[PDB]
Design an enzyme around this catalytic site. Structure first.
Site, PDB file in Angstrom:
ATOM      1  N   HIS A  18     -32.658 -11.196 -10.346  1.00  0.00           N
ATOM      2  CA  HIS A  18     -31.277 -11.012 -10.766  1.00  0.00           C
ATOM      3  C   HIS A  18     -31.315 -10.229 -12.081  1.00  0.00           C
ATOM      4  O   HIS A  18     -31.998 -10.630 -13.027  1.00  0.00           O
ATOM      5  CB  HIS A  18     -30.666 -12.397 -11.000  1.00  0.00           C
ATOM      6  CG  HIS A  18     -29.222 -12.387 -11.386  1.00  0.00           C
ATOM      7  ND1 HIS A  18     -28.224 -11.952 -10.538  1.00  0.00           N
ATOM      8  CD2 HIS A  18     -28.595 -12.826 -12.504  1.00  0.00           C
ATOM      9  CE1 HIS A  18     -27.050 -12.131 -11.114  1.00  0.00           C
ATOM     10  NE2 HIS A  18     -27.248 -12.662 -12.310  1.00  0.00           N
ATOM     11  N   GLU A  46     -31.733 -12.660  -5.792  1.00  0.00           N
ATOM     12  CA  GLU A  46     -30.791 -13.071  -6.829  1.00  0.00           C
ATOM     13  C   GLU A  46     -30.973 -14.510  -7.322  1.00  0.00           C
ATOM     14  O   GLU A  46     -30.754 -14.804  -8.495  1.00  0.00           O
ATOM     15  CB  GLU A  46     -29.354 -12.916  -6.318  1.00  0.00           C
ATOM     16  CG  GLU A  46     -28.984 -11.513  -5.865  1.00  0.00           C
ATOM     17  CD  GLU A  46     -28.585 -10.611  -7.009  1.00  0.00           C
ATOM     18  OE1 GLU A  46     -28.674 -11.043  -8.178  1.00  0.00           O
ATOM     19  OE2 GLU A  46     -28.174  -9.464  -6.738  1.00  0.00           O
ATOM     20  N   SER A  60     -23.478  -8.889 -12.546  1.00  0.00           N
ATOM     21  CA  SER A  60     -23.239 -10.338 -12.484  1.00  0.00           C
ATOM     22  C   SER A  60     -21.839 -10.707 -13.004  1.00  0.00           C
ATOM     23  O   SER A  60     -20.848 -10.324 -12.397  1.00  0.00           O
ATOM     24  CB  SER A  60     -24.330 -11.084 -13.263  1.00  0.00           C
ATOM     25  OG  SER A  60     -24.356 -12.454 -12.895  1.00  0.00           O
TER      26      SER A  60
END
Ligand SMILES: *[C@@H]1O[C@H](CO)[C@@H](O)[C@H](O)[C@H]1NC(C)=O
Ligand SMILES: *[C@@H]1O[C@H](CO)[C@@H](O)[C@H](O)[C@H]1NC(C)=O
Ligand SMILES: *[C@@H]1O[C@H](CO)[C@@H](O)[C@H](O)[C@H]1NC(C)=O
Ligand SMILES: *[C@@H]1O[C@H](CO)[C@@H](O)[C@H](O)[C@H]1NC(C)=O
EC number: 3.1.1.7
Lengths: 532, 532
Positions: free
Chosen positions: B437, B324, B197
């Site tokens: 995610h 995600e 991320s």
């Protein structure tokens, strides 16, 4: 005699015609208006002056002056749509097929031919009403109307060339039917008007126009709706095109009077030779002289009329064909040919998109391209070809019709929707074109019942089923037989939006015809073009 | 002793740690910069002054000051991401896991934690590098960097708060590794930086920034790319937010000097309490203080750098997870709840779309809605929920990464792409959230090898496979074993664009990852927003 009928306009003598080992009466070439010639060119039609003696109605009349397709000389697929009688400005006549013995007061159906408002004839073999009249026992009428500049040149403000005269020709014929069909055994209070493409758009226009509403009971629209993008122009665009036509013929353009006088001295073919030179854009599925939103025949914009319910409220039956766009791509888009599979390159796809949505800016073109492209396989020739086919059909026919059906159903008294997807076994056009624009007509008119035409037994059955749906709807406002054991064609409602397929397979009911693409064409794209 | 290492900054003593019935060395809490406290808050980092004696590196260091998630108190699913050590501005330290016996010159991997640039810790149980270091025999390093206002408050033009200092913290740690890892048995010429991320975006930023390129050999980006919409802001927006933060704390705003002085006198928690009040829009997946395009760390716009090939050319391995966006919808979109199936109404879908693309005008919002709506079944709660999930994931993670991979591959020396779609059998988050995610991290770090954690045998196998791919790539620039009999992970090329799925099922190769949606997000929407 069964072949002699006394009408309010005078006596007419028909002819006995054979049909499926039987016979019926036919009254061909009955005049409903004065010949719109000379000083009358471009003018609103005038009722035919009554005549003494007997009018000989044994033969088809002349066809109106029009552009003739010579793209494939000798080819039946295209020539079957061309005028089959001599052309003349003296062309406002109608034809009537009457069951034998003559009925007393039966259902009447009036056919309005299509042809993009630039062509069409009531005399085509494919429009022979004897099969339908005989089989379903209805009085079948086919009218005619001026096309091209002759019927739609529009110089708003002028009474010499006001525009929409072709639509008024149609109205005058409907008025004649309203006033005289009773003498042929028809019920003037049970008249259904039906037509295909420009004829379907015309039917919708009569539903909208206050001056036409009272002349018929129900309506059927085949592959056409009044709000189609090619079906009308503004008063300003109509004027611009009229002036450009004059410019193409070296006319004096100082005033409408000068322009019209010049245009009236030209031979019919002189106007036709330059007719296509007045379009705005490089495009396909766009015609030069079409109906104009004048504030008379059409009180206000079509959209405002549809939204407020300003139209005749009755029952309607309408639908579309699977591949409406193929004809237009073949005739004007790069990469398409009659004798090849027409696999389209990514580049020709782009060119096709621009020709298909001529009014869109680059962002708009990108939106269309994105909507119809499979990015996992963008160089697939079959997918690009079929994608373009869908673009043309969705934009010009299907989505405008779906917008019409949804707006109409809110105020109407009953809607029946169909999706015709059967490709005739004897089609001479290539396979890539699929279920072509206009090829449901032969089924509606019962040609498959004629053995010599080489249709299959299943196709004869499909035709009989379709003719019965059409005629039963015309008679009762419902295509379904009261208390029958056959599958029922459900009513299209605002909530369920059901429709049926029309083919040789068992009836299947579906919902929301091409809704995904039509939300794009009817809601998103217009918003994008107006904002950018 | 194996636990004593003499570095250029001084001696450090590590600790022996058990791992899968064996042991390895760990050096925790090694300082790489001077504590950025007091007058140093917001300033670029300064190298740690060398020390005499032995630095006690037996325990984890403090975590940087950050917003702490209290949305689900006591819930492991969320608390596993929160700081697990005391917070302090004195937080610039790194951790090293070294195989035993100490290697001579082996592959080095440096982990950069994510957390939207507003949170993150190098000490999370999920980032324990002992399993990876032991199993793959690599020297594993995890660094730390300032987050939130502390690491990204930006007042361009000022040298007291220039912005991007958190990225410079990362660079200083990479510099330390380059200069000292050799003493721990690592090869400074074979360093792979990897992160998830914001950590993945950070990795891409070091690939781009001229000042960071020479400090590492290869890179791995997990669910993040430098061009993500939430990953950076302009100098003007950064300044606007810095001023708004001051406004929230009753600061003197007459000059940068006044503002910064005021902000430096505030306790850490005072800044954090109002941090979220400076965002432009009502939105999700948008964070207050992030990297700024300054013309220094980033020479020009990210797009121009990617287009001209202005970046480090080497091999990269990157990918995304199937769902995600679920985390962000759960925390900020109406209709989503942790304990329900979160079926979304058509109305909440609309609200979600506006929160997901805060910068779009109404036409833009309509385009997104159309692209992700099944108009044949628009009131389907499952479809609306999953549609929104895809919108968030595609816009914020997948499509920006796909834009990055395609631009990079044109100039790079080898790209390997993956799509992680295995939902862990022991996840405590609801089923509707899918493959969340950040949940591929536990597989990359080998947690499934720890029996007590309750993973299945297939998941242990998946983890071992993933760790070997990562480490082999780090060692050779290719995830595949030279001359092995196992299925091969194909190279992603500009032409074929191949990638593999990562799950417990037999390897499958695919092409053009979510290309349809990414053409929308990367090409069409930007054009629409810029034209309208
Ligand atoms: C007109 O009618 C007569 C019969 O009265 C007959 O010759 C034919 O049907 C028509 N004339 C033409 C043009 O053949
Ligand atoms: C049509 O109108 C009649 C009479 O007003 C009404 O009874 C009937 O329900 C209507 N049918 C539909 C489908 O609207
Ligand atoms: C610091 O190192 C010593 C051993 O020298 C030991 O007490 C422990 O590992 C560290 N101190 C703390 C805070 O426990
Ligand atoms: C990487 O670079 C080397 C040396 O320049 C070259 O031989 C090789 O083909 C490149 N590999 C790729 C996939 O570009």
């Amino acid at each position: 005699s069964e072949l002699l009928v006394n009408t309010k306009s005078g006596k007419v003598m028909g002819t006995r015609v054979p049909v499926l080992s039987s016979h019926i009466s036919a009254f061909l070439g009955i005049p409903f208006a004065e010949p719109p010639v000379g000083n009358m060119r471009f003018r609103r039609p005038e009722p035919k002056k009554p005549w003494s003696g007997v009018w000989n109605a044994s033969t088809y009349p002349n066809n109106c002056q029009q552009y003739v397709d010579e793209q494939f000389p000798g080819f039946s697929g295209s020539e079957m749509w061309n005028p089959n009688r001599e052309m003349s400005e003296d062309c406002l006549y109608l034809n009537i097929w009457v069951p034998s013995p003559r009925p007393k007061s039966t259902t009447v159906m009036v056919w309005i031919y299509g042809g993009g408002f630039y062509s069409g004839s009531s005399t085509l073999d494919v429009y022979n009403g004897k099969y339908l009249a005989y089989t379903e026992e209805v009085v079948l009428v086919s009218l005619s109307y001026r096309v091209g500049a002759f019927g739609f040149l529009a110089l708003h403000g002028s009474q010499e060339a006001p525009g929409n005269v072709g639509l008024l020709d149609q109205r005058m014929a409907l008025q004649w039917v309203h006033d005289n069909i009773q003498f042929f055994g028809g019920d003037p209070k049970t008249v259904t008007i039906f037509g295909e493409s420009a004829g379907g758009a015309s039917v919708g226009m009569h539903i909208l126009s206050p001056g036409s509403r009272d002349l018929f009971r129900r309506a059927i629209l085949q592959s056409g709706s009044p709000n189609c993008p090619w079906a009308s122009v503004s008063v300003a665009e109509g004027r611009r095109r009229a002036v450009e036509l004059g410019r193409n013929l070296n006319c004096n353009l100082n005033s409408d009077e000068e322009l019209i006088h010049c245009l009236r001295e030209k031979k019919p073919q002189e106007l036709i030779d330059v007719e296509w030179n007045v379009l705005p854009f490089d495009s396909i599925f766009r015609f030069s002289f079409v109906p104009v939103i004048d504030g008379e025949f059409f009180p206000t914009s079509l959209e405002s009329m549809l939204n407020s319910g300003n139209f005749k409220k009755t029952q309607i039956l309408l639908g579309v064909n699977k591949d409406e766009g193929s004809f237009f791509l073949l005739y004007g888009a790069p990469g398409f040919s009659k004798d090849s599979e027409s696999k389209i390159s990514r580049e020709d796809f782009m060119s096709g998109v621009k020709l298909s949505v001529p009014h869109a800016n680059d962002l708009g073109l990108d939106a269309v391209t994105l909507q119809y492209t499979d990015w996992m396989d963008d160089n697939n020739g079959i997918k690009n070809r079929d994608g373009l086919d869908d673009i043309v059909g969705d934009h010009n026919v299907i989505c405008p019709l779906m917008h019409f059906v949804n707006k109409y159903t809110k105020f109407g008294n009953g809607t029946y929707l169909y999706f015709f997807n059967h490709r005739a076994s004897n089609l001479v056009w290539p396979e890539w074109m699929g279920v072509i624009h206009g090829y449901e007509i032969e089924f509606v008119f019962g040609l498959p019942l004629v053995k010599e035409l080489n249709y299959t037994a299943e196709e004869e059955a499909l035709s009989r089923r379709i003719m019965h749906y059409w005629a039963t709807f015309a008679k009762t406002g419902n295509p379904n037989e009261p208390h029958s054991q056959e599958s029922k064609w459900p009513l299209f409602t605002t909530k369920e939006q059901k429709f049926i397929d029309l083919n040789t397979e068992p009836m299947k009911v579906h919902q929301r015809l091409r809704v995904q693409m039509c939300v794009f064409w009817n809601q998103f794209l217009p918003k994008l073009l107006n904002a950018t």
